[PDB]
Amino acid sequence: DRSPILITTVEGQNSISIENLRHKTGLIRAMYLNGFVTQPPAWIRNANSNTALLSRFLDATPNLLGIYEAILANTYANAVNVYCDSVYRADIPIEWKLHQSVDPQDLLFGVFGIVPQYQILNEAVPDFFAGGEDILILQLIRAVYD
Amino acid sequence: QSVVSRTPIPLSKIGLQDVKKLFDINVIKCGSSLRIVDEPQVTFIVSYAKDIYDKFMCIEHDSAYEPSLTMHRVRVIYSMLNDYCAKMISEVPYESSFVGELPVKSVTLNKLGDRNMDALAEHLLFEHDVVNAQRENRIFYQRKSAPAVPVIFGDDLEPAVRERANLYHRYSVPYHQIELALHALANDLLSIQYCHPTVVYNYLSSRAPNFLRLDDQVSLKLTSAGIGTLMPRPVVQLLDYDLVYMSPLALNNLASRLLRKISLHLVMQMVTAVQQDLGEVVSVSSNVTNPASACLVRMNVQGVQTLAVFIAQSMLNPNISYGMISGLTLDCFSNFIYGACLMLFQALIPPSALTARQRLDINNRFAYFLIKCHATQATTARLVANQVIYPVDAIDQWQSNGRDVLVAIYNNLLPGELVLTNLIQTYFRGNTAQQAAEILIPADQTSYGANETRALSAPYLFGAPINMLAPDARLSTYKRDLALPDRSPILITTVEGQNSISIENLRHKTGLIRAMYLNGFVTQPPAWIRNANSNTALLSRFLDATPNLLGIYEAILANTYANAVNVYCDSVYRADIPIEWKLHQSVDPQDLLFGVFGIVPQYQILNEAVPDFFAGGEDILILQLIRAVYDTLSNKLGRNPADIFHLEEVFKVIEEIVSVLVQQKIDVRKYFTESMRSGSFSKPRWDNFLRRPVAQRLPNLYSVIMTQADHVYNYMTQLTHIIPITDCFYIVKNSGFVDRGSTGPVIASSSVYENVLKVVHTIADFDAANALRLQRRRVDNTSYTDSLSDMFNGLRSISSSEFVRSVNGRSVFTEGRIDAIKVNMRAKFDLQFITEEGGYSKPPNVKKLMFSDFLSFLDSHKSDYRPPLLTVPITIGLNNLGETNSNTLRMRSEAIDEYFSSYVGAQILVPINVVDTRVYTEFSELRNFFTGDVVIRDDPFDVWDGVKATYIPIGVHGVRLDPNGDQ
Amino acid sequence: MDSTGRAYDGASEFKSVLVTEGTSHYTPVEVYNILDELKTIKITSTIAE
Amino acid sequence: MSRQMWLDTSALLEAISEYVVRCNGDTFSGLTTGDFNALSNMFTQLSVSSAGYVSDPRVPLQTMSNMFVSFITSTDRCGYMLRKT
Amino acid sequence: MSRQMWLDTSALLEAISEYVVRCNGDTFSGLTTGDFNALSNMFTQLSVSSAGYVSDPRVPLQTMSNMFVSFITSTDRCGYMLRKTWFNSDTKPTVSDDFITTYIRPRLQVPMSDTVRQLNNLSLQPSAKPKLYERQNAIMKGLDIPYSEPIEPCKLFRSVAGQTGNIPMMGILATPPAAQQQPFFVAERRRILFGIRSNAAIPAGAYQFVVPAWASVLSVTGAYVYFTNSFFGTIIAGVTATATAADAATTFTVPTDANNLPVQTDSRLSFSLGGGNINLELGVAKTGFCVAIEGEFTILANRSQAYYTLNSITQTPTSIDDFDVSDFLTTFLSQLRACGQYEIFSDAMDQLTNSLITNYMDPPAIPAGLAFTSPWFRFSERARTILALQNVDLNIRKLIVRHLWVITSLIAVFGRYYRPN
């Protein structure tokens, strides 16, 4: 049964829902474009400018649609595999997991620059079963112990 | 660099022989093998041709599983306008001959190949029947006088040159109308594309303004154009010019051209002499540095140039560009010179020319100046206490942020503070404090996120709000007639009485400059402590000379026609236009100084500049054409092409088409970019383009062409019913048809007739047939079979012999009906005719299709994702026993039947009923079927191509500036 | 000079390259679902295999 | 146009009808009777030409009548033929 | 512009309504409904100005009603719509008005729209309560109505030579009879009634009934036919509903069916009253009888034209319904009163309905005796009045009723979102 996580719902056949971003869009609007009690410093003099820039930022958000298309394509063809999962196991030590750092700010140009292709390119094909080698051995090690 | 053509589908000439024929004629002498007939029946078999327009049919593909095809067809249709519709039949050959005593001009059938009705008739039996037919041919296939002109030009012409009946003749040729059909459209194409030179002359000459005229020789040539001449006809239609603001590319071109056209002609004194003159008026001590003295050096000519040109464009279309004012120091207004200039400058430009940001700063810098220099110690204090204004030493609290301080000062003034109430109210052109504070455009509706207050418009020009700028409709009526866009340039100043330009605005700002420097301060600017005199002087001479600025007004108004009769001008400020699309340059109000002293008005205008007229409108035509083509493509399709195919694939079709309509590789893509800097396609911008309703109709030319296209589509669509295709084919053990001894035209066939089949199994569709083929089962110890084959065996097999059975010479069919499987699959049938001479020596080789072959088919396509097409062969034996005649016993009856057995054996077939033929027995009617009209002008039209008709301006002349609509 | 843009200048140089293209060979263009369905096939086909 | 033009066409239509009645039940499989040939050719002249092949005579005749009623019922269109001249 | 252009837009606004009804309480957070998708797109098609997602669909819908009221009131503007030709030909008029430009234009996809429409008349379960658009088409262009759409007989009613009205004929049906009277034919909401009243018993045998012009359009299915003595709840006297298990069968036949149809039986029937007459055969004499047909009533195929064209009208004055317009006005009215214009509107309407009739009679003047007994929205009555003018001949009268109706409806649709402020 286990499968990978759903990054966002897929209605239609190539109609990808951005309802998730739209939610944050509203929150972002509430956070800055609705007036403050004691405005952040950046906003004392360039109030207008920020409003305009951030407003464009929001109007361009659907562009992130492109990322959705890509991720979605990989979770259906490319990387989909039997050992994918969506059940969070909280007992795994952090030291065992792979790690890297990310800058949320990079998402800026993502918003203003990504160009959707309105279509999913499932050109690849899954190697659905690779990766068991270790499990098998552990499974046998355990069964032989018995 | 789009260059639209005026004649997209040029006519080409063709010969009657080159017309593509849709029918084949077979002639056979039908006899009997059973009786002795003295006169066999000469018969004519008319069947359809085999290559019927393939590029459009594509029998190989089923339009029901490939919606893409219909799209492709629409594409083809247009290219067919060129390959067929544009090729005009112009030469039907004829000779002088008589019919009795009466002389006639008859079509020379002799040169029409296999439509040579004369030769076709030599097939009849007796010489006399031939002669009669041949003479009847000279009667029906002849050249006669034309009943009426075939080409319908809608123009109103001089009788002398008007196309008339007797210039044409109508020929009756051995072709069915269906065959000539397409070529008849040429007349329609020839019509909307070319017209008589005269018309072109009228068009150009009448729609010409007062100072332009056609060249002498051109006018003469276009006028003396004799009968039978054609020149390409002008395409005129009010376009949806508002689209320019929807496409970056389109707007960039509007701006690009708006700027190229600007041309001002100013005359100014010597930079020197002006210095030398003020130098005297102020008393410049070549040792003392003082305001008055200093400015006389930052006086350059180049500045005035730049300044004027700006004032000029800023007045043609508010949405192309903005200016960035230089030196807006916090208290710049305390520098009377700069101050006076900035205040004046505000009368040469509409609000639209300055950043809504700066426009606001200016108001503030002014309020600072008022509070600093013209406010009472008591007035200041009150404001500060009520938190309207911040103390003057709070240098930092005055730097700009949203609030329009001036509006606030004004809103909180007291009745007794006359001094200020004047300054402010005058600055704000009479609007009340609560008016000045009105929001014309909410910030959330501008690409630059800042409210558009009245106070931000009032000080500029006539003081009207940016959204409702007063237009210069002087040439309105003239534009409307020519069909140019219904919009004008911004009204920079009124033009009263007889050629008198009003300085109304400058006057206003002059009076304000006087009231803020030459009247007296509360706390005079530091610059004025020691230079009060020299200042008052210089400023005095300054105000006395502002009328010299009239010069700019002239140089601008001089080109009234050029400024308005064009596509690029507009006067409504669309605030939503992306600020990054606009161009911008720096402006120094001080440069305007030398202009006030230097510019010398010439007081009468002598040369008007050549308007651009329709130049640059092609982009709109292109756009509208794109939408047009799209809508057509989607109509013939049933839904939006994008719902089914990748936008790219659709565009590729639209491109190909549109480009044929304008003779130029067009690229839909580029019109809808993200911005002027990024060339990425903006699906959204495209969607809005399609979402917009269609305002204006297309120009007539394009509408006709597209309609001529639709007709062709429907014409072809109809020719569908004649290509070889059945909705089903039958599978059967054995079959054939021999009808020996018959006198009919059909005496043998690879197939049978429908009523002889008994359907005992029906295979619904390709899928099902394929499914049965794959259900294998074990029969016995070493063999297997398959549901389809298994079903085929269930059929009764009728001995080959039983088909050719005969009784005393006549074929008979004692057997029942043929057990068969009905397969409802789409299939093409390859027809073939064979003539039976009567000599039963060498058996014919008839193509027969076996069950085995059908399986071999189903296995080569087992995986296909859309049904494949089975080409089923079917041979028909034509009775031509007429060439065989003797009563001598040569062979045994059994031998004849055995001969005919060559036709039997087929296992996969289509009924003979499928084959649609027309069979004529009297030559007469064969002719009556094959007769059609072609009306053709005796002498070919003389089409003038390289005619060069361009406007030329007349010399210098008295120019009258039409006065503005008064009261 | 008229809704076409250009005036009555030189002669119209007619390019035949613009029609002779795309007319020739008819290559069918696949629909969305059909295209996609065909891919789902390869995916499942393999997972099954 | 001409009052004459309308008659000439009316005549043609009346001719089509005539030959329809002439062909009723006389349309046999292996032959092209003169009457039918004539009927066929008359259909051909009825339409424009740009009306293409006639696979089912019912259609062009049907289309023609439809256009006629939407014409003969609109004063704005068929007005011309109502004036004295 | 074109009458067609108006209908098309009405249908749009009328469609926008439909979907607004569909989306009510079905607008959730993470869902995308085909319905809301349709709606939000339709909200776009209104304004020629802009095409951005409508954050508040109230705004443009309002601006539109306002613009409309301001147009429909001034006779200088909406005058062209009151010409004889506007209700007749599809000739795009040369009129330039801000409203017409911004909101009216063709909107229905062609030819598809018609195709669907006809395919619809054959549909199994058509809307039981049709949009106005359908009537607009039947009343104006004379189009067909769905073959199996139900209808209440009494609306269909019109005045006949024999009896003047329907509802009024009630009181008479109440009064005991002087002597065997003439046959009556009345119609309720869910049933048709016919019979012969008498104080003296009338013999057992064959009796012929002439079905009226207005009811020869009817057809019923799933019907119970029996002997009753009530009309709209009121008691009919001079008729008996008595009977006994011994009584001989009482059958009636119609020209369209060669079989006897039983009365006072539990079987459900279906027959066509378009045959022209009913043949009843009383098995046992009754002291006044009244037969009732209660079932599902439908208007025969290709006959709805009689009802919607006002061709079923032969007398004068006549009883005439309103094609249900009254039921659609409700909203607009309640919205008028809201801002205090119910008054000022009635005056602009009277000028409209007047100025309209004017253009209908050559030479160009108000008729004599134009006594409007009711206000613009009680159409049913105003129609009776127009149809009662002896001055102008029947045809022109009818034409005015139809033309008036279309305008009336057009308002009922466009006004609703009206809020001046």
Side-chain angles (χ1 to χ4, degrees), chain B residues 397-461:
Chain B
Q397 292 306 298
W398 277 84
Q399 292 306 314
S400 289
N401 66 84
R403 61 176 342 216
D404 188 325
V405 178
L406 190 63
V407 176
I409 315 281
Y410 189 0
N411 224 303
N412 284 302
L413 287 183
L414 296 171
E417 304 171 308
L418 293 177
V419 199
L420 288 171
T421 313
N422 193 56
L423 276 288
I424 290 176
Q425 189 172 296
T426 291
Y427 176 74
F428 282 156
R429 255 244 168 58
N431 307 69
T432 57
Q434 337 98 2
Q435 277 186 73
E438 214 177 10
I439 284 64
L440 301 168
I441 305 187
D444 55 276
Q445 275 171 52
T446 71
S447 65
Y448 48 101
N451 291 298
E452 276 294 349
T453 72
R454 186 175 289 267
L456 283 170
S457 310
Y460 310 81
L461 226 66

Side-chain angles (χ1 to χ4, degrees), chain E residues 258-281:
Chain E
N259 284 296
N260 292 292
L261 289 169
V263 183
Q264 207 82 345
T265 174
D266 271 337
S267 302
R268 306 193 99 217
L269 338 171
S270 46
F271 55 80
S272 188
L273 290 190
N277 67 285
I278 308 181
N279 178 61
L280 173 60
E281 295 200 65

Side-chain angles (χ1 to χ4, degrees), chain B residues 780-943:
Chain B
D780 61 42
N781 280 191
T782 52
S783 67
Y784 64 88
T785 202
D786 68 291
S787 290
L788 181 62
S789 271
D790 208 22
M791 180 163 60
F792 170 76
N793 302 323
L795 308 181
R796 234 202 90 211
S797 197
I798 305 170
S799 170
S800 273
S801 157
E802 281 305 298
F803 275 99
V804 298
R805 185 184 213 73
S806 61
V807 177
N808 290 324
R810 259 305 304 181
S811 286
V812 175
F813 198 61
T814 49
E815 274 307 315
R817 289 188 294 140
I818 326 185
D819 269 33
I821 299 181
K822 191 185 180 198
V823 174
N824 296 323
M825 263 199 272
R826 185 216 191 204
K828 158 191 175 183
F829 65 92
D830 185 49
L831 187 76
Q832 245 212 4
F833 279 135
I834 290 188
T835 45
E836 282 306 313
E837 316 299 276
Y840 311 111
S841 55
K842 296 104 177 180
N845 187 63
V846 185
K847 280 193 289 180
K848 295 175 285 252
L849 196 55
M850 310 304 203
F851 181 58
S852 93
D853 296 320
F854 177 56
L855 302 177
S856 185
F857 178 69
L858 293 177
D859 289 323
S860 292
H861 297 294
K862 50 185 181 172
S863 290
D864 289 25
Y865 52 85
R866 75 171 48 107
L869 180 63
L870 182 49
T871 309
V872 177
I874 172 183
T875 313
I876 298 282
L878 289 182
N879 171 319
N880 190 56
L881 303 293
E883 310 219 353
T884 280
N885 255 300
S886 73
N887 196 356
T888 259
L889 303 175
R890 300 181 187 300
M891 73 239 294
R892 337 151 44 197
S893 176
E894 294 84 55
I896 291 182
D897 290 346
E898 205 186 65
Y899 172 82
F900 282 113
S901 74
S902 301
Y903 288 71
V904 316
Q907 249 148 45
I908 266 59
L909 60 66
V910 285
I912 303 179
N913 321 60
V914 178
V915 197
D916 189 8
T917 47
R918 317 260 307 188
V919 48
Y920 297 99
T921 115
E922 28 178 353
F923 189 76
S924 166
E925 306 298 314
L926 166 75
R927 185 201 298 117
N928 301 344
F929 178 73
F930 290 94
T931 63
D933 295 11
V934 275
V935 187
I936 308 168
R937 195 172 203 278
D938 292 351
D939 268 59
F941 280 109
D942 178 19
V943 174

Side-chain angles (χ1 to χ4, degrees), chain E residues 46-80:
Chain E
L46 276 188
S47 53
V48 177
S49 58
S50 184
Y53 175 62
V54 194
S55 52
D56 195 334
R58 289 177 296 193
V59 171
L61 259 173
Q62 239 176 55
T63 297
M64 182 238 91
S65 286
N66 286 37
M67 211 91 106
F68 173 78
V69 184
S70 183
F71 158 92
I72 226 295
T73 40
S74 177
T75 298
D76 293 307
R77 300 174 70 184
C78 75
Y80 91 89

